[model samples]
Target: SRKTYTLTDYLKNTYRLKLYSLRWISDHEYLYKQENNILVFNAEYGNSSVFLENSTFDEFGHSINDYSISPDGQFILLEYNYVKQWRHSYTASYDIYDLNKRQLITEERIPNNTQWVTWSPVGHKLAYVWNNDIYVKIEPNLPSYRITWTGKEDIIYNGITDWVYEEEVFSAYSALWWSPNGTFLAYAQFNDTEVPLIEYSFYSDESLQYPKTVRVPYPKAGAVNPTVKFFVVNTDSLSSVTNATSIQITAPASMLIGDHYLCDVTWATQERISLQWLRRIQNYSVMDICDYDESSGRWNCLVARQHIEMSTTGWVGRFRPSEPHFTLDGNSFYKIISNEEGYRHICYFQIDKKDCTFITKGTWEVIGIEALTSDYLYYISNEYKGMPGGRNLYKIQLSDYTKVTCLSCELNPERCQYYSVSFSKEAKYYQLRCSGPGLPLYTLHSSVNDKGLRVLEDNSALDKMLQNVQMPSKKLDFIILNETKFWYQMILPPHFDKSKKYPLLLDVYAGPCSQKADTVFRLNWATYLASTENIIVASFDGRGSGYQGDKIMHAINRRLGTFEVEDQIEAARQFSKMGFVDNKRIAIWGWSYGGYVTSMVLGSGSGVFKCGIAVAPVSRWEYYDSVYTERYMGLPTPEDNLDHYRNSTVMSRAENFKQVEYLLIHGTADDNVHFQQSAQISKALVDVGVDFQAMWYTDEDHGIASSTAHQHIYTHMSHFIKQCFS
Candidate 1:
């Protein structure tokens, strides 16, 4: 009855069967919902409650798709959706159930196609998006009032973000924000009339003869961006939706004035809000703080502070600008940014002070903030001296930077090298997740003591299963050139022998801020490639990789498909020069941007790579989103850096594909990169009479990663890599 792990078995058991969830309600309590039952677990008293799982919920029949509780926990707002929208944004129906009353209020309901509703910090006040317009409810007993009205189909969007904004600028569905006290609501409005529309067919078998064409407002590079306006709603008296009555916040200016974005909004208090504004190029960002007087119900453009983060090498941030965390009194705030040494560290800022105190310093990076207390700041870092990829928790004194202590340093150091912590509200307790160089271990720890804190999940069962299977090991090292140190992690077969030459596969995703060579254990395709096929799979964090710092990460900015591509080729060449790697059997492959890099590497004319796979690749910078592309490459106008844009395109170098074995893959309906990217590459290949293999997933997005498709895609890739090696 028992069988070994085939590709299907690994997909069924290990990859797809991965499971985890969050368990936090308070410092001492945790909440979990299992289907129809809701759990209120008190970790302190070992107590539990059937969190409003009564008869009323059963009879209502509006099965909760998702839900959120009010600030006081007296009410639960349930969101129901029969359809999906963009990432982080969705059209959903809403139903509010009164916990104390044990009933769903019939009068208070939201219609279908309503955007994800907004909840205030400490009250029952609610705001929602409908018809691209924003609605506000001041009191629980009152009806919702209209705030914005010019939200027509083609031209206007209020509260709800357009497609481009959702994917790039906002990274959210709703553009509304609520104050902590529930008295005021601030939202963003978009005017997309000037921006061009992208028309695509929603090919449904049951529908029209031809696919039903749908137009989406998307801004490509060098295109006219939508004009955005910010408005704060005073719940006390909000009636008219005219420009004269609505106070509009002026967007930050750059060298190019008209092109900009209102990136994010954070509330320091009910009165003070910080709105981050970025230039068209994203080289500079302004954290504009405005004061909302509760008494007058008016907003003032109180302060505007610009943060310039243009590195000579790359764009700012590992991803986007890190959101600042303000103190309770709103007197000061903390931000993690790249310092003079290029390492990301914690820096403290004051309301009036111009200078900032660097809290965490050195040549290492403070990955992210975990918890903040009055005395100390908790963070995750790979600062284990020689172990560049080891992630461990550390805490430093808030007032003094020198008093730093590694919290999870010696906690089973052998088994737990890469760990993440979920700290309680008071930072007194934590659920430590050890994703290892060994077996995954989930354990509970304490701030003060951990005498008898038992294991949550040792994954001993999985270890027993893994004992029967062959696995791979990774050897980490550094590759240096021109005084720059590039970290490379090579996946070797079980019981690796140095004398034997193995075919090397360069797994790459050499985009801006991408890091592939990490110490974290992976049981994915690379492992299968190494263990089963006896191939040496290696990844190099070369130029444009992050956490190491801004210098290398920014190196590929304004010149995509250049340095990143060269780094991969160079890394492969360096690997081939090694005694253990087969020189003529080297190959490269990647997905998305990695795909771009792979294509570039194969077409490099270096006579290095034997074959390469490019999945969901972007052929040109102009085909990508405006926010991301313009940030790195800028506008492609002849007056600007037009030559750079032309030189960076993968399509321009397609003639180099003649001598290489290239495999191009894409999803026919990839929304983010678009199917057109692969189409352009395929056209180039055909025009040059270059014979290559290509596979397109029907109606699939960028991932091509759902149901049987996920398993199938990987299987095909595994075969392709094998064929290349053979």
Candidate 2:
């Protein structure tokens, strides 16, 4: 029965079994942990041998949480994590063991309660940010050096990512980047002295005298963000936190004149480092190139060049441009950009100059860039077929940009439509992952010779599981508006009837560079919504949608809540144009950025939406994280882009929110888009005499995504949707 699908027993634990810790040690060899034993497996043989026997550490609420193999594969760092009662970043103790000696090193070099640890690219040496200061060990030596001493709490945080940088800049939790040769290390120092502390009450238990409050230095939009500066550490000298060693690779003083974000760090060579500095408005990025001017000799470095300004449609990328893929010739850098038809494509820039040229040009977007094999740029894109949801690896010849060829199109047209690739070291052979349009398949394909193919995993269990379940039928289609095609996906009710009008739910997340219409297989909350509730759940990738290219994605650049919200309204109207959808019974819901869009749509007075559930939505761009908000909406002050900020907030149009059955939901302790977002919106709603339904989970963060919290939130939303429909 469809009723059985919603049961907690089958829905919760029945699907997705926990597999052993799987880590790819190399292209073919992988390291996995089975219980207390670390095991290694090779593709040539199915046999796995014990890499290490765990010390059975489950003492003082501490256990071996995870492990990592050094780049050289000579050592493994075991992280004994202290699981805290709450979900805030806790601590982890590390123990390094030599595989050759088969014994744990009897050294107490790593301090206890270290939050994060990082390994260098080549050797066994590693570094970690403890109590905000970085500590490095060339090898198992005693406290090799304290990278910085002035890593005072609240005022300054070194090495490790501060609260906002983790979410915004370079998307690195470990804010340190090691040079290719492992000699010079580049890290950012955050001066959070000006950013105010955000305090949220974590009501753990009702029996407590008062709620436990956690405060973090969070820089809200338009707020004075932390003054961050990049630094290059000189490791050759004898270790200490002395000025004689470290050099501040600070952005050129003029470059940071407008509020700026240290966008990314690129190691051009062992000595040459490139840093991208983003302005407050975010349309342009100033990239500064620095090199070791061995002239000073004592770990000397100088700023060599600056590519100060380059315009973009929206903030740079989906989150940010992933570290640029360098060509083998070392001539240029490749990045995904919207310069081509607003579709993401390979754009290259000379290492010596400010010139960037488009390498690949197509109406479709290059989804993921792998690496260039000296001559050709390899990537997975849907350029082969117009199916925005589908993917195939295609290479563009560097010599002639038009010499583009599709790799996965000829593999298996029927069963292997959506595929992903993991290339060998030299891009000679790639492990192809055929994810769905149907039951997924996996195989290894040799780039050198198309005749050679290897079958990897057939996903037999998932196929077998599908036979027993009444899976919702998924359909992919496009809605054209203003002569522009917008892609969308729908998870229809089981045995859906075209003749009968069904309650429609927009399972939307229309954020920038975000494509909800994809071919990835997953049984999520949306599955439950469509399965049990007879709801037609749909996702639309309209304006600001990625993979279509820059034009569509950057449509919302400097403007956040405008076209993105309108696209949803337009998509909803278009989706309802189908006879099967009940236009009056339509409701939308989204989380995080999606939630922000949902709120904006509900407040648009766009009659297409009957109701909306904004879970952890952003009220205004100014109230959100500085880096993320500034990237899209640009730097806000009532003076210049004042209209940009004014037009982007949901509260600005709060009066219109009373028109629909709006459900405002947020976790009181949301760290990402803090609850103040919804708070400000709800406050506006109330001030306008607009009554709406609201729910707040006590200690749940933005995810609202754990424990009984997720279940309750979804169930409540399901109930709300049902009420809106009836």
Candidate 3:
């Protein structure tokens, strides 16, 4: 007797797979956490040793939130009193514990509620940000030296990213980079004195009477962006001066002529560094190779080595510009960029060369360059079987580019098609994570011979449990639109019959550079809908999807709400024509950008979708962030794209929403896509005399992903879909 997967089972994660969380301490040794204890494992012999027992912190006064091991494995940095600020930013109290002495350092303690803390790349030295200022500690028990003196509370940020930079630009909290040997520290300073602030109310608890108003420096489209400055401080000579002085490295003259952003920083060698700067328009970018002069205490950018990257059809590499992977000598580098045919590939560049040699060329794209060795350059790409949705690990020889090999393609080809790999410190060992077509399989392999040493986790327990249940199957196929191959995936119901009709749901996230259709195996609400409700859940990668090239990705370039919106409607119409799909019972839904498309599709009056749900959707482009919105839709002024900006909002078609049932959901404290977006959509719908449903999650951000609220929203949406079908 087999049981069906229920909503409660999915919510409680009864079928969750186990993962062997690992951190490589050396080429042959790794740290694994299991049952609250840290164990060290040898890659070659499959042996285990305890690094830190779970009971070591049993009698500790405060609860430890997390811990970080030093690179040399001499100490552990304990983090407690954790407080979250933004998506990737947080504050916590830190304590250093000496593993050799088995004692916590009691002298010269770190400040409470430190904003950010990180260890040096090579040594036991530490760096942190407190009160928006940068500090450096030569040793754990020593005092800190202040490197920045002009740090204000919210207007100035040093060694850490501000609101916009943390969310959109770097997608990281810290803006600091340490040299290979911990000799120097490079960081970017952000001045938000002129940027605008977005304020919202946060109702914390029931015991409080008045709600606290949270304000952050957030710049929308065509707004005044933050000013950035780069600096490099000599950490080795911090003891020589009372107040350590930092050397400034300004942007190039061309970038200094207008608004620009410091996007990337990479250290090629101890004395050589590279910085990438993107213009405010985001269509042009520059990479400057700077060399440090020890005698003059300054950095000089080589005019002959300056690399210019421009995009005529769309914005530069994915979000910002791609980073360069340098060799050991720091002379030549490899980077992923668009070729002549608009396909992204690997290119080799020398420090003084004006042109780069393309090492890879094809119809598919190289996803990323994983690691660089003296002999081979490993990367992840979608060139396997010419399937854009599939990912495989590949290696090309540096000496002979023709000696390319696909490492994961022949390893259990049926059970695993998409793979993600993590290499050890020296590329001696690798952990291959196969996450598609069947159960997820995790195995460790020796890169010297590409031989499997052992299997870490094959999800055998979850597979055994799933064998008794009638699980749903997935169909990974494509549909052609206007002589182009567009991919789509469907989760078919158990015991699917071609002679019978079923209700259909189109899950969408048709944003720029978005890839929704993939081979990865996931057990989410879609699984429950198909296995329990007998509904077919489908996802389509439309015109603005990624991995296919700029031709398909930039189809909606200056026109955000045109082709992508129509393509979803067209895909749904095609789905309805299928013999196994019921024409009258079709629904659509999405979150974030997907929510924007869902709202746009329901308001298209296409008569294909019966009902739809939009969660935290952007009603207007001007409401989103500047770096993300301006990249696709230029400036919002009369000089550029002003007409399309006004014509493409979800509010413009409010009257058409009356023809279908629609539900709008938003979190009141959403920082990314604010609650004001949904409020404006509701106001416009009300003005048009349209009746629909709406939801407001109190004190929730864009994700609406708190424990209780996450379950509540999915359950609510499930009921909505069931009622719509009925």
RMSD of each: 3.1, 3.2, 1.1
List the global CA lDDT of all models. Answer: 0.77, 0.75, 0.91
Q: What tens digits encode model 1's per-residue C-alpha lDDT throughout 1-726? A: 233345655577563322334467567766766656677766544467887664546666766677787766788888776466555666777888778877676775666778668777677878888888777765544567777778887579888888888887667888888777776778889999988887665675555587767677788888888878888876656644432245576755552365777877888876788877766767776676778665765676544343444444455566667777777777778878888788889888886566778888877788888877777778899888655677888888776788888877788877778889887667777777878777777766666643326566677777777767777787888978899788989989877888988999998997887778776767787777777788999999877877777777777777788888888888889898889899989999999989988987887799998899999998888888788888888789998878898887787788899989988998776777888899999999899899999998876777787677788889888888889889
Local error of candidate 2 at 593, Å? 2.5
TM-score of 2: 0.91
Best-performing candidate as measured by lDDT: 3
Tally clashes: model 2: 5
**How many steric clashes does model 3 contain?**
0
lDDT per residue (tens digit) for residues 158-193 in model 2:
886678887676555677889886887778888998
What is the C-alpha lDDT profile of model 3 across 1-726, one tens digit per residue?
Answer: 588888988999999977867899888989998768889999999999999898888878999878999897988999999988889999999999988888889888889978999999878989999989999988888888888887887799999998999988899999999988899999999999999999999998898799999889999999999999999999988873578879999969999999999999999999988999999999999999898998999999989878999999989988889999999999999999987898999999998998999999899999999999999999999999888889999999999998899999989888898999888889999999999988999999998988899999999999999998989999988889999988888999999998899999999999998887889899999999999999999998888888889899888888898898898888878888888999899999999999999998998889888999999999999999898899999999999999999999999999999889998999999999999999999999999999999999999898898999999999999999999998
Error of 3 at 401 (Å): 1.2
Q: Against the true structure, candidate 1 has what lDDT?
A: 0.77
2 or 3, greater by lDDT: 3
Candidate 1 vs candidate 2: the lDDT winner is 1
After superposition, candidate 2 runs with Cα above 4 Å error: 1-4, 7-11, 17-28, 32-37, 43-50, 53-62, 82-90, 205-207, 239-244, 298-309, 312-322, 328-331, 340-342, 398-402, 450-453
